[PDB]
Amino acid sequence: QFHQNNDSFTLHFQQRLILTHSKDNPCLWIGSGIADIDMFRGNFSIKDKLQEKIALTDAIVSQSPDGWLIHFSRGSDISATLNISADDQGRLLLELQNDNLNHNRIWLRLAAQPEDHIYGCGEQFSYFDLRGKPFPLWTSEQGVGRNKQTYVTWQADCKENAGGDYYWTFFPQPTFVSTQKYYCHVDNSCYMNFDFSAPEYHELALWEDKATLRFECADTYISLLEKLTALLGRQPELPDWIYDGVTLGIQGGTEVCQKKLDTMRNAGVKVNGIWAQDWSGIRMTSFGKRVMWNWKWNSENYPQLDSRIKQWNQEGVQFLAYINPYVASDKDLCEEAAQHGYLAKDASGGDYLVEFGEFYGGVVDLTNPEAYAWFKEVIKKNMIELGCGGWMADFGEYLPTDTYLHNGVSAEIMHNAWPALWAKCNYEALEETGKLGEILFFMRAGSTGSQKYSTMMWAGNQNVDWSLDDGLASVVPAALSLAMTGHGLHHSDIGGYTTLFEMKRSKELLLRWCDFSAFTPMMRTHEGNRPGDNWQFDGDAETIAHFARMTTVFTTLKPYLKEAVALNAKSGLPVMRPLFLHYEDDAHTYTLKYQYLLGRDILVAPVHEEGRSDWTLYLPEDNWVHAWTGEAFRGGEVTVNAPIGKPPVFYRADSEWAALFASLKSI
């Protein structure tokens, strides 16, 4: 539905009002800015020197039988064209192209209603409903603290501009869902700011001279996500062994791994894996114990690993490793990359050395098909053929904007696109070895296409604290925001990661986090950056026993989880779901941030505060059974006892899975 008067028009798409334009209230501005983008250790400082911002108030429409073409102008020397058409699947397609490259800013307004909620924009840690705020979309480090009013954030800012803020994330994406039951996906990867704060419109700011946007509607959110994932990609099914226990994050070598494994197994903990990020060596820095970034098994630290991997596998234990797409400048791979011209370049034509925190690395130029192939062979040869069942595929958010890439695309454009590219490299390693569905890699950074190429997201680095913006809590909006952006497999470090400034992980925080992760599709621990300052999974007999209990819980859910994972693969129906996917008529479910459905039938509200013996949450109208007592409940706000090991989890009494669920209160 396109309606027009002289310099005035509206566009409806399946009855959603998308655009309105008039001389008085334009939908389009263009102009120009000079980007001053600086990075220190992945923490970006983005300044614009805005030169112009010009409202294109004149619009001349011409019509094809396949669309409308709108010439916008403000005099002869300022103009842009908007083509409105349908793409090959009938999605609404807007193509914008400014007059010339000098006009490298776009602001486009979309119509909205005050009541609309907005979800998505990738992986968001402070907000799930985005309505009422702007979100800059620039992949970076996620922040330490992430709130200017908390102390840790202030410390991290002083120390290295590292505290961040509510919108910082390693997986921003220019994709959102409206409670008008449509999504909007922007194909650009330039800097963008999605402004959701005006009651009557959404404003999308693009730092480019052109923009493509697609929209699709549906009658339910589930169908909408089916459509969104038809566009962006659907993840494979998880390997069957992911459901079989906890993956133990261990460092310090083979014997330590063995000793800890045995401690856990012998106490009855269900262990499916050992994840040893230091498989390649350790680098000590002031931040803490980091990995040596040269992607080859270090047999001095991990003697007999080649054989031990298989002995572990014989007992149902996978070995997981660590790789990122950078290479330590003081090691072999970086040298080999340098010799073949496989590294991103600086303006002088040298290889760009990035400062990563008291060491330097090259950036493997994944835009060079040869470097891409070579790096994929590194994975295949040095990890898959070694016998890894999986790995952390980390980073992807750190490309500096003054690197020069083999494909000739500006680093200011390639920066945001990097994660998906890295994801694809991993995905293809698996695909080329027949290991999709068998090997599992997990990623932190993401971008458009991570929905196809990342077999699992993890929530990156939480503080080992109970903060809303960077603690246990924040993982839930991260998971739900991703679900709404088309990625339905999400987990977090059991216990958090970031151990700085007197933050140290308590036993209590370890156990609460364990209770949370038992109700997600993957259980995996982390030592954190300072292992010896954090409570760990084997800190005492009670911790071990808690793990044996909650791993038993997790493994009981295996068939349920697997079905939910199948559904994710088949139709983009995410494993951790916002309540409104199934309780659409309940207005209260649209504003929940810290509870989710695990599958259709289990409602989870993790305790995210220290010192609680009870917990308050919302049950939508259904017949619920408390998992630990069998107690029946109906909808409305409820407070339950929530000691450690009995997280606030409820299941639908009418679930075909009810007898499985009913066995939980007997563990």
Question: In the set 291, 363, 494, 514, which binds ligand NSQ (CB under 6 A)?
Answer: 291
Smallest Cα–Cα separation from 40: which of 469, 358, 496? 358
Measured N-to-C along each axis, helices 541-556 and 507-517 cross at an angle, to the nearest 10 degrees, of: 10
State the binding partner of 5 from ligand NSQ, Ca ion, none, CB within 5 to 8 A by kind: Ca ion
Rounded Cα–Cα distance for residues 296 and 298 (Å): 6
State the binding partner of 497 from Ca ion, ligand NSQ, none, CB within 5 to 8 A by kind: ligand NSQ
Smallest separation (angstroms) from Ca ion to the CB of 615: 24
> If binding is defined by CB under 6 A, does position 216 make contact with ligand NSQ?
no
Question: In the set 141, 208, 470, 538, which binds ligand NSQ (CB under 6 A)?
Answer: 141
Smallest separation (angstroms) from ligand NSQ to the CB of 419: 13
Smallest separation (angstroms) from ligand NSQ to the CB of 177: 27
Smallest separation (angstroms) from ligand NSQ to the CB of 356: 6
Q: Are 523 and 494 in contact (CB under 8 A)?
A: yes
Nearer to Ca ion, 471 or 620 (CB): 471
Smallest separation (angstroms) from ligand NSQ to the CB of 503: 14
Smallest separation (angstroms) from ligand NSQ to the CB of 461: 5
Question: In the set 497, 547, 580, 615, which binds ligand NSQ (CB under 6 A)?
Answer: 497
Compute the Cα dihedral for 296, 299, 304, 308 and give only its sign. negative
In single-letter form, the type of residue at position 665 comes to: K
State the binding partner of 491 from ligand NSQ, Ca ion, none, CB within 5 to 8 A by kind: none
Rounded Cα–Cα distance for residues 312 and 6 (Å): 73
> If binding is defined by CB under 6 A, does position 491 make contact with ligand NSQ?
no
State the binding partner of 269 from Ca ion, ligand NSQ, none, CB within 5 to 8 A by kind: none
Tell which residues of the chain come right before a gap with C–N over 2.5 A.
none
Nearer to ligand NSQ, 203 or 394 (CB): 394
Smallest Cα–Cα separation from 375: which of 419, 332, 426? 426
> If binding is defined by CB under 6 A, does position 44 make contact with ligand NSQ?
no
State the binding partner of 141 from Ca ion, ligand NSQ, none, CB within 5 to 8 A by kind: ligand NSQ
State the binding partner of 281 from Ca ion, ligand NSQ, none, CB within 5 to 8 A by kind: none
> If binding is defined by CB under 6 A, does position 546 make contact with ligand NSQ?
no
Binding mask 4-33 for ligand NSQ (x = CB under 6 A): ------------------------------
Nearer to ligand NSQ, 277 or 467 (CB): 277
Nearer to ligand NSQ, 41 or 588 (CB): 41
Count of residues near Ca ion by CB under 5 A: 4
> Within 440-479, which residues bind Ca ion (CB under 5 A)?
461, 470
Greatest C-alpha distance within the chain = 79
- The position carrying tokens 């350790």 is 282
Which parts of 326-481 are beta strand (E)?
326-328, 354-355, 360-363, 390-393, 440-443, 457-458
Q: Are 329 and 351 in contact (CB under 8 A)?
A: no
State the binding partner of 470 from Ca ion, ligand NSQ, none, CB within 5 to 8 A by kind: Ca ion
Smallest separation (angstroms) from ligand NSQ to the CB of 482: 16
Report CA-CA distances (Å) from 450 to 64, 214, 426, 521. Answer: 35, 18, 11, 18
Long-range (24+ apart) CB contacts under 8 A made by 589-594 are 589/618, 589/620, 590/117, 590/129, 590/179, 591/117, 591/129, 592/128, 592/618, 593/127, 593/128, 593/129, 593/476, 593/477, 593/480, 594/473, 594/476, 594/477
Q: Which of helix, strand or coil describes residue 529? A: coil
Rounded Cα–Cα distance for residues 33 and 568 (Å): 41
State the binding partner of 142 from Ca ion, ligand NSQ, none, CB within 5 to 8 A by kind: Ca ion
Binding mask 99-138 for Ca ion (x = CB under 5 A): ----------------------------------------
> If binding is defined by CB under 5 A, does position 155 make contact with Ca ion?
no
In single-letter form, the type of residue at position 243 comes to: Y
- The position carrying tokens 């199948």 is 566
Count of residues in the chain: 667
Nearer to Ca ion, 5 or 311 (CB): 5
Q: Checking DSSP bridges between strand 523-525 and strand 576-577, what pairing results, if any? A: unpaired
Return residues touching ligand NSQ (CB under 6 A): 41-42, 141, 277, 290-291, 356-357, 394, 444, 460-461, 497, 526
Return residues touching Ca ion (CB under 5 A): 5, 142, 461, 470
